[PDB]
Write a structure and sequence with these properties.
The protein has one domain (about 1-100): Winged helix-like DNA-binding domain superfamily/Winged helix DNA-binding domain (Arc Repressor Mutant, subunit A, Orthogonal Bundle), CATH 1.10.10.10. The two termini are about 30 Å apart. A hairpin with a 7-residue loop joins strand 1 and strand 2 (about 70-75). The relative contact order is 0.13. By secondary structure, the protein is mainly α. The radius of gyration is 17 Å and the shape is elongated. It has helices spanning about 1-15, 25-35, 45-55, 75-100; strands at about 60-65, 70-75. The structure holds N-(9-oxidanylidenethioxanthen-2-yl)ethanamide. N-(9-oxidanylidenethioxanthen-2-yl)ethanamide binds near residues 11 and 90. N-(9-oxidanylidenethioxanthen-2-yl)ethanamide binds near residues 7 and 90. GO terms for molecular function: metal ion binding. This is Transcriptional regulator, PadR-like family.
């Protein structure tokens, strides 16, 4: 349903941040270019997501230099562990699926 895909939006949003702090206009078109023009994100959509992650302490926000105000987001410490738990969660279920295709023939 929808909470597999929202579980996938965070894991890639958690990775344009893993590789340098960034703002949204940049994050937005950094995932559009990463998506060959297929994953177009909204400003309002991204913000609600980052607010939740920021409340849960998965990312934090700070300001830039000048000029004009500009909110930047960075991967926090416990956001680093989550990103690799979702990674170690692939390591199991990806061999579990093949072992199930093996326990037949
Ligand atoms: C590090 C790593 O392997 N991370 C990773 C790769 C691919 C996926 S696919 C996916 C799809 C839908 C929801 C979640 C989801 C993942 O957590 C990962 C994680």
């Amino acid at each position: 349903p929808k909470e597999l895909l929202r579980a996938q939006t965070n894991v890639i949003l958690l990775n344009v941040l893993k590789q340098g702090d960034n703002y949204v206009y940049g994050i937005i078109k950094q995932v559009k270019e990463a998506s060959n023009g297929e994953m177009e994100l909204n400003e309002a959509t991204l913000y609600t997501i980052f607010d939740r992650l920021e409340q849960d302490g998965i990312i934090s926000s700070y300001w830039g230099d000048e000029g004009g105000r500009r909110k930047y987001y960075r991967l926090t410490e416990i956001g680093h562990e989550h990103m690799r738990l979702a990674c170690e969660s692939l390591s199991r279920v990806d061999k579990i699926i093949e072992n199930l295709e093996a326990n037949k023939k």
